[PDB]
């Protein structure tokens, strides 16, 4: 096949001007979409913090209007999901992964409005879920929508545009143009057969969407940690050890997140009403906690800065950790719309700082700063639970900007994926397609 | 569908044998790459010290400069044409082939030929980079262990050949991320699926950087300081810069190729006019690396200086032309050694220029020419060799001005878009395709 190869090599990196332009459009749209989505969740958490001032005294009355508020939005969310678009529950990433393997339909006329508005619900009420879920799915749909509305033909476009939409969305979720692209080519793209996804394309989209996200959320970052110190070479072994711990814990967290999906199904049968009512029940539980101990609720983007600086005690950390494991399982497994990324960054930080503190007073001659350990572990859960180390590394990197810590971060995140492998854990995004897909065969 | 579920559940499972082997390939390329670096330092030491020897008599020194690079260049070209012909030029295009199983990996040959031979062309101070030597040297090291451990199967042979190449590109710039991104943007078989385990490639790159740092820690190749930021009303400027890089990118490809030709005529393919034409160009460079050093050498030393806005506009245009003229001469002539490094330098220098003009055309944008230099630094790599994603990340890992990510991406993309619409081709593919179609003609 040598003759054929020379023909191919000279035709490499040539993507039809039609796709390139359409990618520009998709990014632009996901961008605005993601921006608008963000504006909304802001607002809804704003009302909730404003209505808690309104009923300022009478403690038990307030503890009631916190719960009842998250509870009322969660419900509105689960309902909008189970009734109009079943396939929008959960994260949303496993569903786009399938769509690239052409094994799940991309019902955009449904999912766009259901996941958008429905997510505002579970996220506004302050549940422990991220943005990626909503946006990566939302994004890919936007990508299908324009493939459909411009009746574009061919395997290339349907894959490429469904991809760039998904990336643009993940970027706009963290202001991470690089991570968005790296994610598509580490976990989105069909992982076993070759696929005609044009990389230049995916880019043009991610860029447009980031430019959009910056037009509106400029002059303030999600995570600000300041320039941490450096990591001496005789310090590295420590980060391996951290990775190992992340590595035995990563599969375990997968067992639960899955086994919890089960245990919670028994509690409502598959019934719209015990679900929605079980929904506002968990949703409310969180909006209440987002007052009596806020570090156990919400996305988690707020406790990163605080925890990294070494402001929590060892006690408050261990608490925060357990409390979050127990609410992330509860919110994601229950099938409310919304990703597991963000909460996973939070758990990683918190666990990292813990390691960091213990490390700091075990070795004074290394002159550590627990904050670096919080930063190496931040993208470690993403590397042992999710099995997408390369995207995590760069995701952390684009949000905390402490490139001097690239070695540590890599080593920790690698120890993670090695130990997650040798203890039989599986990529939590695949294990979820594989379930949702083998359940489409075990009913014939 | 039944088959996919079977696959999904078995995803990201790379046989413990390969993973372990990747570790030793990295470790090996790391030490190798370090060793190589140490040598080139040394040989440039000597030349700088022997110029002190014969300190006065101007024309006598202008002679011992020339004759020195001339002597090492020759020693290089010879060691190449005699024992390992497939080690001349880059070396990246040859490993690309090896992944498509269309070129042999004569490690028992290339390892020592490219290593010692490169020392030669690089020590004499020619305008070529370290990536060529190391990416190739690296992959070979990768075959060597597949061979020496008789490892069986498609997976290993691809996987180890790749991690080796990466680890090598890393250690060349202390760029663990660029290394991996490069394999998955330009190294891996670009049209059929391939069983290259990423987790594997990583373990290797890591081991090798860890190695490179054990010896070259405490000092970075390019230091530019934290430059200012870039206002959103400024971006359109970086698109324009990308466009200029996008029309110039293919043209530089034409020459780089067309000069490969014009220089063959000058020696027929004959080992002696080659080697004598070698030390003639090699010598020309080591001479210039005195009467105007910014036109010679890899180029890593003029980045800092140019970015700070230390050159006048006149000295910039000069430095530019003079460099096009020597990068073409050195790479096209088929001396061992990549083209990356010289291309980063040319992008900087062209960027600064844009920058100055920009700075006094718009005083209300409050610009610093320095940022243009940094958006352009990886723009040649994005319009000449069509690997924007690796370029962006390669600049980024070496200048650390993440706040410029937007500009950088926009210039670099304006580059690959215009390189596309004015018909250029990935300079690394255009070189395989030539060397592969000359294999059947």
């Amino acid at each position, epitope marked *: 096949r040598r003759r054929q190869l020379i023909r191919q090599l000279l035709e490499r990196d040539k993507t039809p001007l039609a796709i390139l332009f359409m990618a520009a459009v998709v990014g632009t749209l996901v961008g605005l979409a993601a921006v608008a989505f963000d504006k909304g969740v802001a607002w809804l958490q704003n009302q909730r913090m404003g209505a808690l001032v309104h009923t300022a005294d009478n403690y038990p009355l307030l503890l009631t209007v916190a719960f009842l508020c998250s509870a009322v939005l969660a419900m509105f969310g689960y309902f909008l999901v189970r009734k109009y678009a079943p396939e929008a529950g959960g994260s949303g990433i496993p569903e786009i992964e399938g769509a690239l393997e052409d094994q799940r339909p991309v019902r955009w006329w449904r999912v766009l409005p259901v996941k958008f508005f429905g997510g505002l619900g579970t996220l506004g009420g302050g549940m422990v879920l991220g943005r990626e879920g909503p946006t990566v799915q939302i994004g890919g749909n936007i990508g299908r929508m324009v493939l459909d509305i411009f009746r574009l033909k061919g395997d290339e476009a349907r894959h490429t545009l469904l991809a760039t939409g998904a990336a643009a969305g993940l970027a706009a979720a963290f202001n991470a143009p690089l991570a968005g692209i790296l994610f598509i080519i580490e976990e989105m793209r069909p992982q076993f057969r070759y696929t005609l996804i044009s990389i230049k394309a995916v880019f043009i989209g991610v860029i447009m969407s980031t430019i959009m996200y910056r037009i509106f959320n*400029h*002059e303030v970052a999600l995570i600000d940690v300041g320039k941490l110190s450096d990591a001496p070479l005789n310090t590295l072994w420590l980060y391996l050890i951290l990775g190992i711990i992340f590595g035995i814990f990563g599969p375990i967290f997968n067992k639960w997140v899955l086994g919890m999906q089960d245990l919670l199904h028994r509690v409502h049968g598959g019934n719209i009403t015990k679900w929605v009512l079980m929904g506002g029940a968990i949703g409310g539980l969180c909006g209440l906690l987002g007052f009596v101990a806020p570090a156990t609720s919400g996305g988690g983007f707020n406790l990163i800065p605080i925890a990294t600086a070494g402001n929590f005690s060892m006690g408050m950390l261990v608490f925060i950790f357990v409390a979050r494991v127990i609410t992330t399982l509860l919110c994601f497994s229950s099938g409310a719309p919304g990703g597991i990324f963000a909460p996973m960054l939070a758990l990683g930080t918190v666990l990292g700082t813990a390691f960091g503190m213990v490390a700091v007073e075990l070795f004074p001659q290394y002159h550590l700063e627990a904050g670096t350990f919080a930063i190496a572990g931040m993208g470690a859960l993403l590397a042992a639970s999710i099995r997408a180390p390369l995207t995590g590394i760069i995701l952390v990197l684009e949000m905390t900007d402490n490139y001097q810590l690239i070695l540590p971060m890599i080593i920790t995140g690698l120890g993670a994926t090695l130990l997650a492998q040798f203890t039989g854990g599986k990529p939590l995004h695949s294990a979820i397609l594989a379930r949702t897909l083998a359940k489409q065969e075990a009913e014939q | 569908r039944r088959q996919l579920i079977r696959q999904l559940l078995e995803r990201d499972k790379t046989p413990l044998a390969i993973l372990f082997m990747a570790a030793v390939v990295g470790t090996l390329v790391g030490l190798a790459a370090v060793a190589f670096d140490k040598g080139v330092a040394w040989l440039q030491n000597q030349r700088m010290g022997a110029l002190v020897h014969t300190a006065d008599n101007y024309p006598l020194l202008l002679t011992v400069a020339f004759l020195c690079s001339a002597v090492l260049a020759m020693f290089g070209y010879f060691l190449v044409r005699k024992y390992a012909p497939e080690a001349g030029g880059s070396g990246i295009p040859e490993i690309e082939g090896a992944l498509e199983d269309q070129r042999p990996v004569r490690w028992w040959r290339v390892l020592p030929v490219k290593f010692f031979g490169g020392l030669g062309t690089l020590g004499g101070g020619m305008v070529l980079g370290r990536e060529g030597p190391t990416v190739q040297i690296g992959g070979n090291i990768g075959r060597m262990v597949l061979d020496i451990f008789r490892l069986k199967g498609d997976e290993a042979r691809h996987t180890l050949l790749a991690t080796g190449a990466a680890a090598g590109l890393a250690a060349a710039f202390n760029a663990p991320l660029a290394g991996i991104l490069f394999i998955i943007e330009e190294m891996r078989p670009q049209f059929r699926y391939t069983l290259i385990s990423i987790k594997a490639v990583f373990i290797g790159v890591i081991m090798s950087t860890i190695m490179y740092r054990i010896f070259n820690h405490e000092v970075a190749l390019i230091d530019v300081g934290k430059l*200012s930021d870039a*206002p*959103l*009303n*400024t971006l359109w400027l970086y698109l324009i810069l990308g466009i200029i890089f996008g029309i110039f990118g293919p043209i530089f490809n034409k020459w780089v190729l067309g000069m490969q030709d014009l220089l063959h005529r000058v020696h027929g393919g004959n080992i002696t006019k080659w080697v004598l034409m070698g030390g003639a160009i090699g010598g020309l460079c080591g001479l210039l690396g005195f009467v105007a050093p910014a036109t010679s050498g890899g180029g890593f030393n003029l980045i800092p200086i140019a970015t700070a*806005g230390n050159f006048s506009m006149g000295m910039l245009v000069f430095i530019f032309v003079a460099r096009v003229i020597t990068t073409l001469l050195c790479f096209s002539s088929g001396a061992p050694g990549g083209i990356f490094a010289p291309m980063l330098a040319l992008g900087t220098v062209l960027g600064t220029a844009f920058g100055m003009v920009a*700075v006094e055309l718009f*005083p*209300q*944008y*409050h610009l*610093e020419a320095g940022t243009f230099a940094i958006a352009g630094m990886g723009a040649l790599l994005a319009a000449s060799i069509r690997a924007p994603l690796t370029g962006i990340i390669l600049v980024l890992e070496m200048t650390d001005n993440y706040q410029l990510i937007l500009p950088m991406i926009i210039t670099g993309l304006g580059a690959t878009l215009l390189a596309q619409f004015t018909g250029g081709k990935p300079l690394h593919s255009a070189i395989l395709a030539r060397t592969l179609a000359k294999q059947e003609a």
Partner: antibody
Amino acid sequence: VRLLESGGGLVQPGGSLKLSCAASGFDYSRYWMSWVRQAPGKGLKWIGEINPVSSTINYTPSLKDKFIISRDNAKDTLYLQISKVRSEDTALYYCARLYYGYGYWYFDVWGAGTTVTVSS
Amino acid sequence: DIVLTQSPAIMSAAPGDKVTMTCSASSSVSYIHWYQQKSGTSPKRWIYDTSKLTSGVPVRFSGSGSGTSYSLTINTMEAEDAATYYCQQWSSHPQTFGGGTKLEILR
């Protein structure tokens, strides 16, 4: 975060004087700095700006060495030299730290003022 | 260089009143900024990029315009708004301030 200008008061007409603004509570790199003046009971007139690496220093349309804006990032301090002082320069000088949104620069955090009085 | 000119030079109004001052420009400016100078205080960044509010500027305050016309608008004025307001543009070099509207209160 606070700017504290000083060193005004009396000058002989045709004389000259060094105002030193002095900064604290923010990385005094990272910023362009600027001066502006308010003659008594009147509007605002920009004198000049200057970046962090003292590489670029612009002035208002005015004469050859009328003003000299300089800064020294060791002491966290901006300076201003006025020369051959006519009575138009009788004013309050503000120093102000510079910045931007979409991109058009604005005078961000202003100092407190110093007064200059040109008289015999 | 650009000559910005401000409309009411002095304007009385009683708290409650919706209030609008104006900044007009001889050429084409964009993204103008506004300062509030109270008595014997220094100018304070008030509204920037035509309609963004500096942090902790009461939401009664708003800005807009484009081209040659720009206005800052107090919506239900309040007595503590008694100040002198400068507009300022930096869209063309060198930058330039207005003459300043002086707000005055009627009580």
